[PDB]
Protein backbone atom coordinates (compact mmCIF):
# COMPACT_ATOMS: atom_id res chain seq x y z
CA UNK A 1 0.00 0.00 0.00
CA UNK A 2 2.09 2.95 -1.31
CA UNK A 3 2.10 5.39 -4.23
CA UNK A 4 0.31 7.73 -2.85
CA UNK A 5 2.23 7.14 0.40
CA UNK A 6 3.89 10.57 0.20
CA UNK A 7 0.95 12.43 -1.31
CA UNK A 8 -1.34 11.24 1.47
CA UNK A 9 1.17 12.10 4.18
CA UNK A 10 1.65 15.54 2.66
CA UNK A 11 -2.15 15.88 2.59
CA UNK A 12 -2.70 14.77 6.20
CA UNK A 13 0.09 17.10 7.28
CA UNK A 14 -1.90 20.02 5.92
CA UNK A 15 -5.28 18.85 7.26
CA UNK A 16 -3.64 18.29 10.64
CA UNK A 17 -3.46 22.07 11.03
CA UNK A 18 -6.86 22.68 9.36
CA UNK A 19 -8.28 20.21 11.95
CA UNK A 20 -6.39 21.00 15.13
CA UNK A 21 -8.52 21.88 18.22
CA UNK A 22 -8.02 25.19 20.03
CA UNK A 23 -5.13 24.62 22.47
CA UNK A 24 -6.64 26.71 25.27
CA UNK A 25 -10.23 25.62 24.81
CA UNK A 26 -10.68 24.31 28.37
CA UNK A 27 -9.82 27.62 30.03
CA UNK A 28 -12.86 28.97 28.12
CA UNK A 29 -15.21 26.22 29.27
CA UNK A 30 -16.89 27.53 32.46
CA UNK A 31 -18.40 24.26 33.68
CA UNK A 32 -15.87 21.63 32.42
CA UNK A 33 -12.16 20.83 32.96
CA UNK A 34 -9.40 18.74 31.39
CA UNK A 35 -10.07 16.44 34.29
CA UNK A 36 -13.69 15.75 33.25
CA UNK A 37 -12.58 15.44 29.65
CA UNK A 38 -10.06 12.81 30.67
CA UNK A 39 -12.92 10.95 32.31
CA UNK A 40 -14.86 11.20 29.01
CA UNK A 41 -11.97 10.09 26.87
CA UNK A 42 -11.23 7.26 29.33
CA UNK A 43 -14.89 6.31 29.17
CA UNK A 44 -14.73 6.29 25.35
CA UNK A 45 -11.77 3.89 25.41
CA UNK A 46 -13.84 1.56 27.60
CA UNK A 47 -16.69 1.83 25.12
CA UNK A 48 -14.28 1.29 22.19
CA UNK A 49 -13.13 -1.93 23.89
CA UNK A 50 -16.67 -2.83 24.89
CA UNK A 51 -17.89 -2.61 21.28
CA UNK A 52 -14.63 -3.78 19.74
CA UNK A 53 -14.35 -0.59 17.67
CA UNK A 54 -11.27 0.56 15.73
CA UNK A 55 -8.66 2.60 17.59
CA UNK A 56 -9.04 5.07 14.70
CA UNK A 57 -12.69 5.54 15.70
CA UNK A 58 -11.56 6.43 19.26
CA UNK A 59 -9.08 8.91 17.82
CA UNK A 60 -11.75 10.37 15.54
CA UNK A 61 -14.22 10.85 18.39
CA UNK A 62 -11.71 12.73 20.57
CA UNK A 63 -10.78 15.00 17.63
CA UNK A 64 -14.52 15.72 17.35
CA UNK A 65 -15.12 16.43 21.02
CA UNK A 66 -12.05 18.65 21.24
CA UNK A 67 -13.08 20.51 18.11
CA UNK A 68 -16.68 20.78 19.28
CA UNK A 69 -15.59 21.97 22.72
CA UNK A 70 -13.22 24.46 21.11
CA UNK A 71 -16.31 26.47 20.09
CA UNK A 72 -19.31 25.29 22.18
CA UNK A 73 -19.80 25.73 25.91
CA UNK A 74 -21.18 22.58 27.49
CA UNK A 75 -22.40 21.92 31.03
CA UNK A 76 -20.86 18.89 32.78
CA UNK A 77 -24.36 17.35 32.63
CA UNK A 78 -24.22 17.18 28.83
CA UNK A 79 -20.52 16.57 28.22
CA UNK A 80 -21.24 12.80 27.94
CA UNK A 81 -23.92 13.42 25.33
CA UNK A 82 -21.36 15.27 23.27
CA UNK A 83 -19.12 12.27 23.87
CA UNK A 84 -21.54 9.66 22.59
CA UNK A 85 -22.66 11.70 19.58
CA UNK A 86 -18.98 12.12 18.77
CA UNK A 87 -18.42 8.38 19.14
CA UNK A 88 -21.56 7.67 17.11
CA UNK A 89 -20.34 9.83 14.24
CA UNK A 90 -16.83 8.48 14.53
CA UNK A 91 -18.39 5.01 14.38
CA UNK A 92 -20.57 5.91 11.37
CA UNK A 93 -17.50 7.30 9.58
CA UNK A 94 -14.85 4.69 10.33
CA UNK A 95 -16.57 1.38 11.23
CA UNK A 96 -17.65 -1.44 8.96
CA UNK A 97 -20.56 -2.01 11.37
CA UNK A 98 -21.25 0.97 13.63
CA UNK A 99 -23.21 0.20 16.81
CA UNK A 100 -26.79 1.35 16.40
CA UNK A 101 -27.94 4.54 18.08
CA UNK A 102 -29.71 2.61 20.85
CA UNK A 103 -26.33 1.14 21.87
CA UNK A 104 -24.89 4.59 22.53
CA UNK A 105 -27.94 5.51 24.62
CA UNK A 106 -27.48 2.23 26.44
CA UNK A 107 -23.77 2.79 27.24
CA UNK A 108 -24.65 5.92 29.16
CA UNK A 109 -26.88 3.68 31.31
CA UNK A 110 -29.81 5.60 29.80
CA UNK A 111 -28.60 9.09 30.80
CA UNK A 112 -29.94 10.53 27.50
CA UNK A 113 -32.52 9.52 24.90
CA UNK A 114 -32.22 8.26 21.29
CA UNK A 115 -33.75 11.65 20.48
CA UNK A 116 -31.15 13.52 22.47
CA UNK A 117 -28.28 11.57 20.96
CA UNK A 118 -29.52 12.12 17.40
CA UNK A 119 -30.14 15.83 18.01
CA UNK A 120 -26.68 16.10 19.52
CA UNK A 121 -25.42 14.26 16.41
CA UNK A 122 -26.90 16.96 14.18
CA UNK A 123 -25.48 19.69 16.36
CA UNK A 124 -22.00 18.16 16.09
CA UNK A 125 -22.24 17.76 12.34
CA UNK A 126 -23.38 21.38 12.21
CA UNK A 127 -20.55 22.54 14.48
CA UNK A 128 -17.85 20.61 12.60
CA UNK A 129 -19.52 21.47 9.26
CA UNK A 130 -19.25 17.80 8.34
CA UNK A 131 -15.47 17.97 8.48
CA UNK A 132 -14.93 14.47 9.75
CA UNK A 133 -11.91 13.10 7.87
CA UNK A 134 -9.47 14.26 10.54
CA UNK A 135 -5.87 13.10 10.52
CA UNK A 136 -5.24 11.12 13.75
CA UNK A 137 -2.22 10.10 15.84
CA UNK A 138 -3.10 6.60 14.71
CA UNK A 139 -3.20 7.45 11.04
CA UNK A 140 0.35 8.84 11.25
CA UNK A 141 1.50 5.88 13.32
CA UNK A 142 0.49 3.26 10.70
CA UNK A 143 2.59 5.26 8.24
CA UNK A 144 5.53 5.49 10.63
CA UNK A 145 5.25 1.73 11.29
CA UNK A 146 6.07 1.13 7.61
CA UNK A 147 9.57 2.43 8.29
CA UNK A 148 10.46 -0.33 10.73
CA UNK A 149 13.35 -2.78 10.19
CA UNK A 150 11.82 -5.26 10.52
CA UNK A 151 8.16 -4.95 11.54
CA UNK A 152 7.72 -5.43 15.29
CA UNK A 153 4.35 -5.93 16.90
CA UNK A 154 5.30 -4.86 20.41
CA UNK A 155 6.59 -1.63 18.91
CA UNK A 156 3.43 -1.15 16.87
CA UNK A 157 1.20 -1.97 19.83
CA UNK A 158 3.33 0.16 22.18
CA UNK A 159 3.09 3.25 19.96
CA UNK A 160 -0.70 2.74 19.78
CA UNK A 161 -0.93 2.51 23.55
CA UNK A 162 1.31 5.54 23.99
CA UNK A 163 -0.50 7.56 21.34
CA UNK A 164 -3.76 6.49 22.91
CA UNK A 165 -2.44 7.58 26.26
CA UNK A 166 -2.04 11.14 24.96
CA UNK A 167 -5.75 11.47 24.00
CA UNK A 168 -6.60 11.58 27.73
CA UNK A 169 -4.68 14.67 28.84
CA UNK A 170 -5.74 17.76 26.98
CA UNK A 171 -2.96 19.42 28.97
CA UNK A 172 -0.37 19.23 27.37
CA UNK A 173 -1.04 17.08 24.27
CA UNK A 174 -3.65 19.48 22.96
CA UNK A 175 -0.67 21.63 21.95
CA UNK A 176 0.90 18.98 19.71
CA UNK A 177 -0.18 17.99 16.21
CA UNK A 178 -1.14 14.33 15.61
CA UNK A 179 1.95 13.66 13.43
CA UNK A 180 4.25 15.05 16.12
CA UNK A 181 2.53 12.98 18.83
CA UNK A 182 2.78 9.94 16.52
CA UNK A 183 6.50 10.76 16.26
CA UNK A 184 6.94 10.73 20.05
CA UNK A 185 4.85 7.61 20.46
CA UNK A 186 6.62 5.80 17.66
CA UNK A 187 10.16 6.52 18.77
CA UNK A 188 9.33 5.93 22.42
CA UNK A 189 7.90 2.56 21.43
CA UNK A 190 10.97 1.68 19.36
CA UNK A 191 13.39 2.75 22.08
CA UNK A 192 11.61 0.96 24.97
CA UNK A 193 11.33 -2.36 23.08
CA UNK A 194 14.40 -2.42 20.82
CA UNK A 195 16.73 0.31 22.07
CA UNK A 196 16.42 2.06 18.69
CA UNK A 197 15.76 5.70 17.77
CA UNK A 198 13.57 7.65 15.43
CA UNK A 199 14.62 6.33 11.95
CA UNK A 200 16.39 8.62 9.48
CA UNK A 201 13.99 7.41 6.79
CA UNK A 202 11.31 9.05 8.97
CA UNK A 203 13.38 12.24 9.20
CA UNK A 204 13.46 12.24 5.41
CA UNK A 205 9.71 11.54 5.37
CA UNK A 206 8.48 13.81 8.16
CA UNK A 207 11.13 16.44 8.54
CA UNK A 208 11.02 15.55 12.24
CA UNK A 209 14.14 14.76 14.27
CA UNK A 210 14.55 13.68 17.90
CA UNK A 211 15.35 17.39 18.32
CA UNK A 212 11.82 18.38 17.18
CA UNK A 213 9.92 15.56 18.89
CA UNK A 214 11.84 16.08 22.17
CA UNK A 215 9.37 18.50 23.85
CA UNK A 216 6.41 16.13 23.19
CA UNK A 217 8.64 13.11 23.80
CA UNK A 218 9.49 14.57 27.22
CA UNK A 219 5.79 14.86 27.96
CA UNK A 220 4.96 11.46 26.53
CA UNK A 221 7.79 9.85 28.46
CA UNK A 222 6.32 11.26 31.67
CA UNK A 223 2.82 10.08 30.83
CA UNK A 224 4.33 6.64 30.23
CA UNK A 225 6.15 6.70 33.61
CA UNK A 226 3.15 8.08 35.51
CA UNK A 227 0.75 5.75 33.68
CA UNK A 228 0.17 3.21 36.47
CA UNK A 229 -0.78 6.04 38.90
CA UNK A 230 -2.96 7.97 36.47
CA UNK A 231 -6.55 8.53 37.61
CA UNK A 232 -7.74 6.88 34.36
CA UNK A 233 -6.74 3.27 33.70
CA UNK A 234 -8.94 2.11 30.81
CA UNK A 235 -6.09 2.44 28.25
CA UNK A 236 -3.53 0.42 30.26
CA UNK A 237 -6.35 -2.07 30.98
CA UNK A 238 -7.05 -2.23 27.25
CA UNK A 239 -3.40 -2.74 26.35
CA UNK A 240 -3.00 -5.64 28.79
CA UNK A 241 -4.89 -7.64 26.20
CA UNK A 242 -3.17 -10.16 23.97
CA UNK A 243 -4.70 -8.32 20.96
CA UNK A 244 -2.19 -5.57 21.76
CA UNK A 245 0.57 -7.87 22.92
CA UNK A 246 0.07 -6.80 26.55
CA UNK A 247 2.34 -3.83 25.85
CA UNK A 248 1.05 -1.84 28.82
CA UNK A 249 2.93 -4.36 30.94
CA UNK A 250 6.36 -3.65 29.42
CA UNK A 251 8.32 -1.27 31.62
CA UNK A 252 8.75 2.39 30.80
CA UNK A 253 12.44 3.26 30.31
CA UNK A 254 14.12 5.26 33.11
CA UNK A 255 15.92 7.57 30.66
CA UNK A 256 15.89 8.43 26.97
CA UNK A 257 19.42 9.85 26.38
CA UNK A 258 18.17 12.81 24.34
Amino acid sequence: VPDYHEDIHTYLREMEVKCKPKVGYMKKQPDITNSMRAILVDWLVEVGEEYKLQNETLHLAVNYIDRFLSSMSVLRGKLQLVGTAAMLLASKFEEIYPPEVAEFVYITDDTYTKKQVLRMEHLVLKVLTFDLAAPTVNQFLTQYFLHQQPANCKVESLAMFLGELSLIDADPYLKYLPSVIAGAAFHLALYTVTGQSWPESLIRKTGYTLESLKPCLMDLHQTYLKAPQHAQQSIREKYKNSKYHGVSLLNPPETLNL
Partner: peptide, 5 residues
Protein backbone atom coordinates in the same frame (compact mmCIF):
# COMPACT_ATOMS: atom_id res chain seq x y z
CA UNK B 1 -22.38 4.14 32.87
CA UNK B 2 -23.39 7.74 33.62
CA UNK B 3 -20.32 9.95 33.88
CA UNK B 4 -20.91 12.88 36.19
CA UNK B 5 -24.38 13.66 37.49
Amino acid sequence: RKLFN
